[PDB]
Amino acid sequence: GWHLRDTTQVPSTMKVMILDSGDPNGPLSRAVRNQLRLNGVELLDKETTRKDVPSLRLGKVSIAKDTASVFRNGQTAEYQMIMTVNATVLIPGRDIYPISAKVFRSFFDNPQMALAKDNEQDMIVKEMYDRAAEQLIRKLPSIRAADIRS
Template sequence: MKLFSGRVFLLIAVLVTLHGCGFKFRGSQPLPEGIQQVYLADPKEYSPLKRALKEHFDFYQIDYVANIPVAQKDQTIAIYLYPDSLDRRLLSLFSTGQVAEYELVLTIKLQVIFPNNEPQIVEFDITREYQDDPDAILAKSRELDLILKEMRNQAADRIVRMLPSLDSREH
């Protein structure tokens, strides 16, 4: 019984310490009040990044609007996506000279405009390593599609999370 109560005390002490220093699980911190509605523009109507961003908006309970009503111009954040680009960098070769491993670099560029503020251009990269196998072309093609989807989801999450730091209205 003493061992059990010692563990409980230790657990409570760790939780109180973590809470006291401001630790929060990733994704558990709500966005500020001013980020409630976002206009999203993309040259490609059905781009994978735009779809991923819409899913993240739903998760964070941010309203997505297809156009900015005149009455809400001073309340709506506008995000303009540029076409993303994917680069492959050679990391290693098989002894036969065929590519064994790539580094995939997805470059994301966007413009964010907060009401009554100057436009801000944001650009960042998401990287992953990808092992190629010339004997399993079909499986590797599917794996590449899954990796790209995961990279775009990570980019969407990063965009939503950076919005509060880009907002200069409260500073």
């Protein structure tokens, strides 16, 4: 017993919103802007004295690459990248609800081609940058809901 979706992934109080970030031209703020755009959101600048506008204040990322498996000899068989991203969303009327996202990819190593493999990484890290952005878009409905109680 299905039906097709009757709004976008983003609430309607956030069709207009600020993207406050400590690093406008970073590779996070790059890939977030692009994701809100892909739900048709009106991004403002933090100059606007206009109002009713919530403000997604992005926070800082972090990326371990952790050894995550080992051959019999003890030399990392398989690393795993782990991106951790902490944001907040301010609501002008009300309150601060801090949200976040974490991604895992993982991959095998090969010293014989260590250069190739460092490349693979950059990509995976890049890819993650978007995967993260999305996880945050998918958490906005949960800010929208749990707030209405108070």
